Design a protein around this nucleic acid. Structure first.
Ligand SMILES: [Sr+2]
Length: 119
RNA sequence: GAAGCCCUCACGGGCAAUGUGGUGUCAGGGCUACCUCUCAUCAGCCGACCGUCUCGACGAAGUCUCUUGGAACAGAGCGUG
């Protein structure tokens, strides 16, 4: 919330998770706020996901600004266990990063586009 | 970066990406490229001697004479470990 500056429509979110699912099956993705963070710092990230129901908020407060000063696109997901499920985890995930998609690049690209537009 | 842990004989359940587990800890460490090598450390297995404290077994040689005395464990005499 304090780190959320725009609401992502349920639909856009639907597509993103799908792109992430096919991303892990095809391309490469990182699970966990620590791995996600290093990807953004190493620049090996194309699209980063960040849950909104993370408590405490400190765990992910840094993602937004760290991404902007890295050109890396990011998007918000409502639930925390969905991001984890979509990332292929048996638990939750406060953040995720698509480290080079796979057969989803087109979509991942559009999702990012739709985001910049959503300001 | 799930390669992990806990419960249950098992089935199975729970924990764990808000990080279980590997690596590492100033002889700094990690990483990339090499040399060599390990007996350091850490984990686990086995597992005492001796010493000390207490407890217990075994364990030598007179119950001889006289006198006194209620009693010899006394005095004098002879004998023993
Ligand atoms: Sr959870």
């Amino acid at each position: 919330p304090v780190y959320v500056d725009f609401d992502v429509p349920a639909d856009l979110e639907d597509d993103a998770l799908e792109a992430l699912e096919v991303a892990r099956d095809t391309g490469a993705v990182k699970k966990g706020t620590n791995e996600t963070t290093k990807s953004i710092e190493r620049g090996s990230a194309e699209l980063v996901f960040v849950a909104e129901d993370v408590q405490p908020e400190e765990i992910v407060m840094h993602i937004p600004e760290l991404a902007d000063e890295k050109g890396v696109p990011f998007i918000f997901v409502e639930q925390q266990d969905d991001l984890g499920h979509a990332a292929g985890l048996e638990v939750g995930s406060a953040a995720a990063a698509v480290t080079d998609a796979g057969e989803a690049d087109a979509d991942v690209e559009d999702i990012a586009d739709k985001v910049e537009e959503l300001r």
